[PDB]
Amino acid sequence: CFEADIAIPSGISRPDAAALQRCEGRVVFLPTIRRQLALADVAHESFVSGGVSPDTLGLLLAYRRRFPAVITRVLPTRIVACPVDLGLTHAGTVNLRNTSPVDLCNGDPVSLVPPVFEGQATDVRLESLDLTLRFPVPLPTPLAREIVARLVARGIRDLNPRTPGELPDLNVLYYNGARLSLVADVQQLASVNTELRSLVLNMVYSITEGTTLILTLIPRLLALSAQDGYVNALLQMQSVTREAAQAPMLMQDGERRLPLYEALVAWLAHAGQLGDILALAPAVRVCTFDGAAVVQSGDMAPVIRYP
């Protein structure tokens, strides 16, 4: 585990000692690797920057440059945390707590998302030690990648107004059913802006010279549309692909460079990496020993290493 401890610094509200008991299996973001550390850098008051608190995109950027840690065992003197970034060498598969409305799967990669849900705030309050605690919500990673694209684009609509007030909310989610509504309260600009720029600048490099030949086959896409099932379902209705349909540009130097093969490389370099440069890295994977295929809300799932 390469054991790391966090002590109980000063005093105890006597029911709130039991509040630390039911947080077993949650995640602490501690911005270090320590053998002992105070509880002051733990809470959300440390997540608050100079003067201002981060938004749910800034908390992504706040959870960027800190280190997650697993609650292992809860003492009245200390709390032993295992440093996820290094000390994931656990054949004992140190256990986590699922605090999420989604019943997951077996075999999901699990990445951490700030509490942004309408009813799972994960707000526990300490008044003897005046601190506020937001636990991250562990979620499956495609469902995690369906969230971060919404919240930045919702902040993309925070730059430009123009349109009438009835906008698509980006606030109805879909997992097999299960209509989810999240919170849209505040959108800090710099958390939107720096997230928007890497969405711009990576999509710059992901276009290359041999990429341009693929753009010719855009009318070839709709030729498969009215003659099969798979393509017509692949072609989305709310897509620009159905909108843009309504050429080599020769410039041929040398022609032994494999121009089409080189196109799919650098496209995958930056447009292939769009979930992980915006959000947190997944290192938690669902692995139950008993053959249980799903893990209930509130359960203690065994946790294995990087996916």
Partner: protein, 245 residues
Amino acid sequence: ARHETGGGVNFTLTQPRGNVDLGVGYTAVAATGTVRNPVTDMGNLPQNFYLGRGAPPLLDNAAAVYLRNAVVAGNRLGPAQPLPVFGCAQVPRRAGMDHGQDAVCEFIATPVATDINYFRRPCNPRGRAAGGVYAGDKEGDVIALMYDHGQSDPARPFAATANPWASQRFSYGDLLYNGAYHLNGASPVLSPCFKFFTAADITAKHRCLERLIVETGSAVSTATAASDVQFKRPPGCRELVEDPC
């Protein structure tokens, strides 16, 4: 058998053993007489072929996403946040459910004068006695028992079918409801009709009748009682179903 995990050590213990029938004749019959309750509420649910995607769509786009969302618009089985290339159809789970699991109703076109006296009876959907039991042991017989409509129907003996739009090869149940073509079957919803219209599964299927009835306290079902609207069976968690049909 030991295995060391997080926390402490974790001993697992197993004892290998076997059995045998040890009876030359039949032993141990099992009757079935009392019912607690139906699991399903016996029906009234449309089938949605937009759950599947194998069918080649319309070519005009103005008819394509007009007729698509004309049906899907509010169905109890209606794919919202629509069909990913990789993923699931995401059946809309509603908030509360009362009577139990749902049954699924599927449809086969029939002519209007296919007389009702063929019904009121244990008669079959595809208009033909379709089982592999009924044949005369020729081993090329059950394609001709299912399709040779120069012959008759063993179920209704004075005729060949009851529905020409069900029975024959490429008789439109044969395109929709045969899993070898599977325009559907990308859908997680269990089709009730896959037991019929499947020449591959009833391709002789087994024929020794004596062994056949002991498997009717066996043969894990097509259905699973674990979902809100019933799904085709995930490969884990077998159920030892009875299922005579």
